[PDB]
Design a protein around this motif. Structure first.
Motif, PDB file in Angstrom:
ATOM      1  N   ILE A  21      14.465  -2.213 -31.950  1.00 35.71           N
ATOM      2  CA  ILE A  21      14.105  -0.818 -31.698  1.00 35.71           C
ATOM      3  C   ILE A  21      15.026   0.187 -32.425  1.00 35.71           C
ATOM      4  CG2 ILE A  21      13.806   0.986 -29.980  1.00 35.71           C
ATOM      5  CD1 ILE A  21      13.353  -1.309 -27.901  1.00 35.71           C
ATOM      6  N   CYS A  22      16.355  -0.006 -32.292  1.00 37.42           N
ATOM      7  CA  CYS A  22      17.406   0.901 -32.750  1.00 37.42           C
ATOM      8  C   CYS A  22      18.365   0.188 -33.704  1.00 37.42           C
ATOM      9  CB  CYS A  22      18.181   1.455 -31.539  1.00 37.42           C
ATOM     10  SG  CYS A  22      17.172   2.410 -30.366  1.00 37.42           S
ATOM     11  N   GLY A  23      17.812  -0.474 -34.712  1.00 37.35           N
ATOM     12  CA  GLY A  23      18.646  -1.217 -35.638  1.00 37.35           C
ATOM     13  C   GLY A  23      19.653  -0.308 -36.316  1.00 37.35           C
ATOM     14  N   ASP A  24      20.928  -0.617 -36.105  1.00 34.20           N
ATOM     15  CA  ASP A  24      22.055   0.103 -36.685  1.00 34.20           C
ATOM     16  C   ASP A  24      21.990   1.618 -36.472  1.00 34.20           C
ATOM     17  N   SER A  25      21.563   2.051 -35.285  1.00 38.84           N
ATOM     18  CA  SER A  25      21.494   3.480 -34.996  1.00 38.84           C
ATOM     19  C   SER A  25      22.118   3.857 -33.662  1.00 38.84           C
ATOM     20  CB  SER A  25      20.059   3.939 -35.021  1.00 38.84           C
ATOM     21  OG  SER A  25      19.949   5.283 -34.614  1.00 38.84           O
ATOM     22  N   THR A  26      23.225   4.596 -33.731  1.00 41.32           N
ATOM     23  CA  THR A  26      23.965   5.012 -32.547  1.00 41.32           C
ATOM     24  C   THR A  26      23.158   5.976 -31.696  1.00 41.32           C
ATOM     25  OG1 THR A  26      26.112   4.748 -33.664  1.00 41.32           O
ATOM     26  CG2 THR A  26      26.046   6.132 -31.686  1.00 41.32           C
ATOM     27  N   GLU A  27      22.515   6.941 -32.346  1.00 40.06           N
ATOM     28  CA  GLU A  27      21.756   7.958 -31.626  1.00 40.06           C
ATOM     29  C   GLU A  27      20.562   7.358 -30.874  1.00 40.06           C
ATOM     30  N   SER A  29      20.304   4.130 -29.941  1.00 41.08           N
ATOM     31  CA  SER A  29      20.817   3.264 -28.890  1.00 41.08           C
ATOM     32  C   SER A  29      21.122   4.074 -27.636  1.00 41.08           C
ATOM     33  CB  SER A  29      22.064   2.548 -29.363  1.00 41.08           C
ATOM     34  OG  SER A  29      22.569   1.702 -28.367  1.00 41.08           O
ATOM     35  N   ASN A  30      21.738   5.243 -27.808  1.00 41.57           N
ATOM     36  CA  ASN A  30      22.068   6.076 -26.660  1.00 41.57           C
ATOM     37  C   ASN A  30      20.815   6.488 -25.884  1.00 41.57           C
ATOM     38  OD1 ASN A  30      24.789   5.879 -27.118  1.00 41.57           O
ATOM     39  ND2 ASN A  30      24.921   7.828 -28.196  1.00 41.57           N
ATOM     40  N   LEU A  33      19.319   3.337 -23.942  1.00 36.88           N
ATOM     41  CA  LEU A  33      20.035   3.054 -22.701  1.00 36.88           C
ATOM     42  C   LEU A  33      19.452   3.800 -21.499  1.00 36.88           C
ATOM     43  CD1 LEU A  33      23.757   3.216 -23.946  1.00 36.88           C
ATOM     44  CD2 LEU A  33      22.517   1.146 -23.259  1.00 36.88           C
ATOM     45  N   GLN A  34      18.638   4.827 -21.741  1.00 40.08           N
ATOM     46  CA  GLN A  34      18.052   5.599 -20.651  1.00 40.08           C
ATOM     47  C   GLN A  34      16.940   4.804 -19.975  1.00 40.08           C
ATOM     48  OE1 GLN A  34      16.819   9.360 -22.338  1.00 40.08           O
ATOM     49  NE2 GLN A  34      18.882  10.242 -22.207  1.00 40.08           N
ATOM     50  N   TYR A  35      16.577   3.673 -20.579  1.00 38.48           N
ATOM     51  CA  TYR A  35      15.537   2.799 -20.066  1.00 38.48           C
ATOM     52  C   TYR A  35      16.141   1.649 -19.264  1.00 38.48           C
ATOM     53  CZ  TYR A  35      12.341   5.347 -23.032  1.00 38.48           C
ATOM     54  OH  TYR A  35      11.588   6.338 -23.619  1.00 38.48           O
ATOM     55  N   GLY A  36      17.454   1.720 -19.039  1.00 37.34           N
ATOM     56  CA  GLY A  36      18.148   0.758 -18.200  1.00 37.34           C
ATOM     57  C   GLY A  36      18.103  -0.667 -18.712  1.00 37.34           C
TER      58      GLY A  36
END
Ligand SMILES: *[C@@H]1O[C@H](CO)[C@@H](O)[C@H](O)[C@H]1NC(C)=O
Lengths: 49, 49
Positions: A21-27, A29-30, A33-36
């Motif tokens: 979903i968030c390959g190599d992306s900090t923004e 990934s953050n 994480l809201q999806y637990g």
């Protein structure tokens, strides 16, 4: 003599839900994480198989 | 780790070593015999092109 052909196993695939979903992306990934545990549960289900 | 009286009596540093990573991954301070997937190795970029 007859031949009976049966499958035994699947390819042991494994998918890293975060990298998918968030390959190599900090923004991303953050936000992910809201999806637990949704991401974690998917990784666990595939590992079990 | 919070005890019955709500006092923190112990802790695991999830970034100390691979055993602590396993403990945090499994949400336990005890790890059973076996193999567990806890992380994902990635080579980082060294240059900006
Ligand atoms: C909680 O406090 C009481 C003393 O008020 C002590 O006897 C008891 O062992 C404590 N519980 C824990 C888990 O430390």
């Amino acid at each position: 003599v007859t031949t009976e052909i049966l499958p035994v196993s699947m390819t042991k695939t494994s998918v890293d839900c975060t990298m998918y979903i968030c390959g190599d992306s900090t923004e991303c990934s953050n936000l992910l994480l809201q999806y637990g545990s949704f991401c974690t549960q998917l990784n666990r289900a595939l590992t079990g198989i | 780790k919070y005890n019955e009286n709500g006092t923190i009596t112990d802790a695991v540093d999830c970034a100390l070593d691979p055993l602590s990573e396993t403990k945090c991954t499994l949400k336990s301070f005890t790890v059973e015999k076996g193999i567990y997937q806890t992380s994902n190795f990635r080579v980082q970029p060294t240059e900006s092109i």
